[PDB]
Amino acid sequence: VLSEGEWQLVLHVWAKVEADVAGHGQDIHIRLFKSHPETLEKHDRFKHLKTEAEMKASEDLKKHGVTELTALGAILKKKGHHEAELKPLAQSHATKHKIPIKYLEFISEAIIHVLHSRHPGDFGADAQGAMNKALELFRKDIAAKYKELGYQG
């Protein structure tokens, strides 16, 4: 569970993300794919992109990233009260896309990495910890939803 202060730190840095959702989404996926190439295999249409510049030039990948970060942003703003916005997310990622919880940890690392790289003055130790707790909570609750749907994350 997060304090109100921690949620404010999360939402404050998220406001910085919202200044360039597309750009953040691209950097997060670039970071993710380079750190964990196996995650690229879950994308039938992005497995062809070879370089960083090609990934940045992909409108498909850019739209995909906005979709994910938008959904995450909406979840974060619920400050933990996100069961309703988590069920559809869990359902598509467990039954359709088959995304292991381990992969959600990977993109979480990428998120924290990109947020630090872009906003060092707004993402200090306290802000990083709060975001980590927020993302942990997200993964925790979605893992439970996974199980309810009969998928071992």
Footprint on this chain of Co ion (rule: CB under 5 A): 68
Residue facing Co ion at closest CB distance: 68
Q: Is 99 in the site for ligand HEM (CB under 6 A)?
A: yes
Q: Is 30 in the site for ligand HEM (CB under 6 A)?
A: no
CA-to-CA distance for 112 and 121, rounded, in angstroms? Answer: 14
Crossing angle of helices 59-76 and 125-148, in 10° steps, is: 90
Report the nearest approach of Co ion to the CB of residue 134 (Å).
18
Kindly indicate which of the ranges 2-10, 11-19, 38-46, 121-129 contains the residues binding ligand HEM, using the contact rule CB under 6 A: 38-46
CA-to-CA distance for 28 and 64, rounded, in angstroms? Answer: 11
Report the nearest approach of ligand HEM to the CB of residue 94 (Å).
10
The string over 30-42, giving b where at least 16 C-beta atoms fall within 10 Å of a residue's C-beta and e elsewhere, is: bbbbeebeebbee
Residues that constitute the known binding site: 64, 93
